[PDB]
Amino acid sequence: YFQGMDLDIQCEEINPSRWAELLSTMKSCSTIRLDDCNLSSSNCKDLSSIIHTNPSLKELKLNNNELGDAGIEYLCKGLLTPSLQKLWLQNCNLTSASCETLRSVLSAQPSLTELHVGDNKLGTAGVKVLCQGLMNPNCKLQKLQLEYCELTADIVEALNAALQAKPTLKELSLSNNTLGDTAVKQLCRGLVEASCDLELLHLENCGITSDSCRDISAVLSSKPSLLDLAVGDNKIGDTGLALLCQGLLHPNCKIQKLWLWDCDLTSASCKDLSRVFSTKETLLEVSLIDNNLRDSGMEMLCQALKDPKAHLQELWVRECGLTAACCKAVSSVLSVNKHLQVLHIGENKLGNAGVEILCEGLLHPNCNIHSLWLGNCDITAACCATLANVMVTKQNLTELDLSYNTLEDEGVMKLCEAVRNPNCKMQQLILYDIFWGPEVDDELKALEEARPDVKIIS
C-alpha cells in the first residue's frame, strides 16, 4: 500500500543542495521526518512554506533538533497559514516562550490531532499558555505528550480546564514531571469530569504514592475507554497497588496494557495482581520489571495465568528477584496457557537449571510463546544444547534473546548449528555483549549468508 510519499531521515548531516533537493520532495510528502539531523532554527522557514501549500502533508516529525524558540516561531509562520495532523517537537530546546506560538497554532488548526513536545523545559507557566489553546473550540487534539517538561503541581487546574474542553482527547502523557499526590488526585477528578473517551494515560515517575491510587482507581472505574495505564517508577508499593486493583477489578475497567515497573512491589502485591490476571479478560500486556516479586510472587501470578479467563499475551518480569525455584511454576503456564505470546524474564538468576525447565514448558503443543527474553540469566554453555533443540523443534518461536550471558564460544556454536537446521523458524536471535573469539565472529558472518531469514543480532 501507498499513502503519499514518506520522507524519513535520521542522525544525518544535512547539506544545503541536498536540502534544496529535498524541498521539492517535501512539497509532495504525506509525512516528513527529520530526526536528530542537527537542524537549526534557520531550516524552519523552509518547512513553514511546505506546511501551507502541501495539501497532503499529514505528519511532521522534527525531534532531537535544536530548533529552539526562534525555530518554532519561524516553523509555525506557515502553520498560521492554511493540513498537518501530527507534529512532533520532542527535545527541540523549546522553553515557555514557544508555548505562545504553540497556543496560536492549536487555536488555528482543527486538523491537528497529535502534539509531542516532551523533553523541553516548557515549565508550568508555558504549559498553562498551551492549555489556553487546547481550550479553543477549534482545537480537535487527540494525543498530547508533555513528558519531561518540568511541570509542577500547579499545572493541574489549567490542564483540568483544558481537558473539560477536549472531548477529542484519546492519549495523555505527563510522565517524568514532579506532580505529586495532591496534583495527581486533582488531575484524576479532572479526567473523570471530562467527557473525553481517554484511551491512554501515562503518569510514570510523577511523584505518585499510595495516597493517590484511590483516585487513579476511580479513573479506571469511570473510563471504560481507558486501555493503557502506565504508572511505573512511582513508589506506590503494595499498598498503592492494592488500591489500584480496586479499579482494575471494577466491572467497567477494560484495561489492556498495565505498566507497573519499578513500583516498589513485593511478593505481597502478587495476591492482588493474581486476582487481576485471573479476572480481567481484556488484560493483554503487563510490565512488572524491577520489582522484588521473588519466586513466591511469581508463583502466584503463574497460578493465576492457568485460569481460562487469563488472556495475557505479554508479561515482562525482568529483574524481579526470580530464580530456578519459580521455573517449574512458569513452565506449567507455558504448558496450559494458550494466550501468552511474549515473556521477558531476563536479569533473573535462573541459571542453567531454571532455563532448561522453561524449555520443558515451551515444547508443549499449545504453547504459543513466539518471543522469549533471557538476557543476563546466568546461563552458560551447558544450557545451549537444550536451547538448540527448542530452536529446531518449536516452529512458532521466532525470537530469543540470550544477551549478556557467558555462553562461551562453545555455547554460541551450538546455537549456530540449530540455526543452520532448516526446520528452525527462528527470525531474530539476540546475542549482545557476549564475549567470543574471532572464529565465531567469522561463523556468524558466514551464517548470515546461509540463512538470511534468521537474524543474529550482536
Binding site: 535520521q10 542522525c11 530526526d35 536528530d36 532531537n64 527535545n91 523533553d119 523541553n120 523545559k121 513528558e147 519531561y148 517524568n176 510514570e204 515517575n205 511505573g232 517508577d233 505498566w259 515497573w261 519499578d262 510490565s287 520489571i289 525482568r318 521477558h344 531476563g346 536479569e347 527474553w373 538476557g375 543476563n376 534473546d401 544477551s403 549478556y404 549482545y432 555483549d433 564475549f435 573469539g437 574471532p438 565472529d441 543480532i457 550482536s458
Partner: protein
C-alpha cells in the same frame, strides 16, 4: 566484537536534557537501535578511551579501571510504538574484555 565496536556502543559525554533523551537518541546515533530493534540494556562510559586501553594482556583477559568513572546505564522500558528508555547515572567499576591488547568487550557494571 572489535575495538571500534566497543567504542561505538559503550564509550561516550554528549549533552541531553535528561537521561531518557540521552538513552533514546544515543542508542540510535551509535547504530544500535536500527531496523526496529531496541536493545534492552546498554551502558555508556564517559572517559578517555586510554583509561580502558591502558597495555598488553593475554587476550580474553578481563581488566578493571582503578578510578571508577562516570557512566550512564540505559534500560528499556517500552519497545512499542517506539523504543523508550529510562536510566541511571553511576560512578562505577568498568570491567572490560581484552583482545589484541585492546578492550573489545564490556563485561562489567
Amino acid at each position: 566484537p572489535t575495538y571500534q565496536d566497543f567504542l561505538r556502543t559503550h564509550v561516550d559525554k554528549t549533552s541531553f536534557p535528561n537521561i531518557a533523551a540521552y538513552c533514546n537518541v544515543m542508542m540510535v546515533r551509535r547504530g544500535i537501535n536500527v531496523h526496529g530493534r531496541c536493545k534492552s540494556l546498554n551502558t555508556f562510559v564517559h572517559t578517555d578511551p586510554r583509561n580502558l586501553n591502558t597495555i598488553n594482556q593475554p587476550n580474553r583477559a578481563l581488566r578493571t579501571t582503578q578510578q571508577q568513572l562516570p557512566v550512564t546505564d540505559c534500560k528499556l522500558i517500552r519497545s512499542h510504538p517506539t523504543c523508550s528508555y529510562t536510566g541511571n547515572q553511576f560512578n562505577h567499576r568498568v570491567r572490560v574484555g581484552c583482545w589484541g591488547g585492546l578492550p573489545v568487550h564490556l563485561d562489567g557494571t
